[PDB]
Amino acid sequence: LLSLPLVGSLPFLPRHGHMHNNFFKLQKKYGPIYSVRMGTKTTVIVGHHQLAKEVLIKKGKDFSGRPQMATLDILSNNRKGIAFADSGAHWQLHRRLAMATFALFKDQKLEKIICQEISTLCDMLATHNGQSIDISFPVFVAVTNVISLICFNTSYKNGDPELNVIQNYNEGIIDNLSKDSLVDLVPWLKIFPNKTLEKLKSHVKIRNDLLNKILENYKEKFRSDSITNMLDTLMQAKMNSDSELLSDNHILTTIGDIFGAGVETTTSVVKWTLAFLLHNPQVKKKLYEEIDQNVGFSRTPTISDRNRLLLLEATIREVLRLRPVAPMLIPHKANVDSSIGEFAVDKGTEVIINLWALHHNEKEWHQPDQFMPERFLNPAGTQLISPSVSYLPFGAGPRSCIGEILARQELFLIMAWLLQRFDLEVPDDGQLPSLEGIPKVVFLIDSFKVKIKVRQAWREAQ
Numbered sequence: 364l365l366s367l368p369l370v371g372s373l374p375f376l377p378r379h380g381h382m383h384n385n386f387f388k389l390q391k392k393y394g395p396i397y398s399v400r401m402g403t404k405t406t407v408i409v410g411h412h413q414l415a416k417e418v419l420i421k422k423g424k425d426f427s428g429r430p431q432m433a434t435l436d437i438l439s440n441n442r443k444g445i446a447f448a449d450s451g452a453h454w455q456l457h458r459r460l461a462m463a464t465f466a467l468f469k470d471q472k473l474e475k476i477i478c479q480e481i482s483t484l485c486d487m488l489a490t491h492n493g494q495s496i497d498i499s500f501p502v503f504v505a506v507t508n509v510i511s512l513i514c515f516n517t518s519y520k521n522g523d524p525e526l527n528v529i530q531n532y533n534e535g536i537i538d539n540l541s542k543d544s545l546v547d548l549v550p551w552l553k554i555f556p557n558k559t560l561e562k563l564k565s566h567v568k569i570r571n572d573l574l575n576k577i578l579e580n581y582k583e584k585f586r587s588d589s590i591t592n593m594l595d596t597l598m599q600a601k602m603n604s605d606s607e608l609l610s611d612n613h614i615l616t617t618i619g620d621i622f623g624a625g626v627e628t629t630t631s632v633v634k635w636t637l638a639f640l641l642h643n644p645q646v647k648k649k650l651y652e653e654i655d656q657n658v659g660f661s662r663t664p665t666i667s668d669r670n671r672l673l674l675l676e677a678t679i680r681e682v683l684r685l686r687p688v689a690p691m692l693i694p695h696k697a698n699v700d701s702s703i704g705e706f707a708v709d710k711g712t713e714v715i716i717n718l719w720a721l722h723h724n725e726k727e728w729h730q731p732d733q734f735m736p737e738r739f740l741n742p743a744g745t746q747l748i749s750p751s752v753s754y755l756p757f758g759a760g761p762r763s764c765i766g767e768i769l770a771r772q773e774l775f776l777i778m779a780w781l782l783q784r785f786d787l788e789v790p791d792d793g794q795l796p797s798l799e800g801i802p803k804v805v806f807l808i809d810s811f812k813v814k815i816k817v818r819q820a821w822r823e824a825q
């Protein structure tokens with residue numbers, strides 16, 4: 364009796380469980396690296412830090428490409444900008460210029476931009492004293508203004524409805540960019556009739572029309588005697604012509620990515636962090652203790668307080684380990700024939716770093732499924748440590764994050780100001796937020812509510 368002919372085989376069920384974890388599980392059987400073939404495209408998944416750091420650092424330039432996807436094409440305006448651009452003259456240029464802008468805020472000192480918007484954030488939330496709210500939007504607004512000040516030296520006032528229009532198309536872009544993660548085994552959208560690409564174009568259209576209107580008004584304001592933000596930095600480079608690489612759509616898309624990443628990543632990590640603290644009251648109590656001890660109520664927190672607020676800095680590290688924004692980074696592509704761990708990797712092959720597998724490796728972490736900020740501390744709790752090398756929340760090499768500094772400061776300051784001033788409790792229905800998460804292009808958390816009350820100790824101190 365014979366075996367049925369086999370036209371196709373996949374090692375697990377499509378759309379069942381999170382991709383990054385299904386890949387991780389396969390490693391017990393196939394080892395830390397393996398490949399899957401879709402028609403002609405071959406995809407290699409890496410789940411070990413030594414191999415990951417080969418792909419990202421030791422051979423960074425080799426694997427610095429991006430694959431082409433229908434949805435990403437629409438959002439990136441055919442592979443322009445930075446994040447979804449292939450490695451090339453345009454990518455390198457805009458990446459450089461974008462990185463260069465960050466210099467213009469080193470001592471408009473970045474900390475003062477951030478703390479400005481946090482103060483407003485905390486004043487908003489004080490009004491909700493005694494109520495249970497979703498804190499998504501108020502935080503969205505804060506970081507939106509920071510990135511806007513950095514990009515255009517403009518910020519939105521309370522009640523500007525353009526903020527809600529931005530919130531709307533950001534949710535829509537994310538919803539349709541990918542069903543779950545960016546890594547789909549089966550290309551379903553090319554198979555069955557669906558309105559997915561249509562919907563994406565509509566959110567992206569609105570986002571684009573809005574950015575054109577910011578550029579055109581700004582062409583009047585631009586003066587080479589003043590370079591204070593990203594758009595100046597980009598218009599300056601243009602007039603020094605590379606001219607093909609700095610067209611209006613090229614500039615637009617780059618700001619697009621920066622605006623996108625600067626808001627959706629930090630907002631998500633704030634919501635995830637609050638969520639973990641709701642589930643872990645002991646840690647939260649010790650966070651209050653810590654900040655009461657080392658900051659008190661005499662002033663508002665500052666970047667210098669990272670030296671003192673070590674438990675907080677560790678909590679932040681731990682959330683980025685447990686719930687990385689991008690548990691599989693953004694996909695990479697081999698630009699040339701190369702290798703990984705002495706296995707051959709052909710040019711044009713897709714290479715995915717399973718950061719989830721790195722962050723949950725049992726041999727690299729003690730109880731990796733557990734929220735344990737202590738792990739980034741010495742036993743005494745007197746300084747931060749780096750307990751595993753299998754830890755790359757911001758990536759590494761050519762394609763590494765370029766907002767890590769901005770990111771880390773935003774996260775630290777927001778959490779510090781909030782804990783200084785607010786009791787953050789489980790809402791009256793006693794519902795806790797599911798920590799399972801929702802894997803989109805960003806690893807999101809189900810929306811949830813938190814009971815906010817101004818701190819008794821903060822009150823007295825007035």
Ligand code: HEM
Binds near residue numbers: 620622626693756770
């Ligand atoms: C807050 C937590 C954040 C995390 C965990 C994070 C993480 C990452 C990761 C994993 C990548 C891709 C790595 C790869 O593909 O090899 C990336 C790329 C990128 N990030 Fe961040 N990010 C964060 C915040 C930010 C912020 C605040 C900005 C502000 C501008 C930003 C801008 C970018 C850009 C433009 C890229 C694409 C770089 C390229 O492809 O050349 N990110 N980030």
Ligand SMILES: CC(=O)[C@@]1(O)CC[C@H]2[C@@H]3CCC4=CC(=O)CC[C@]4(C)[C@H]3CC[C@@]21C
Binds near residue numbers: 446532
């Ligand atoms: C988590 C990461 O590493 C990445 O941060 C680096 C680039 C980020 C894209 C940039 C373009 C964009 C525009 C929007 O308005 C929706 C938000 C996105 C999709 C935004 C999400 C997080 C991304 C994918």
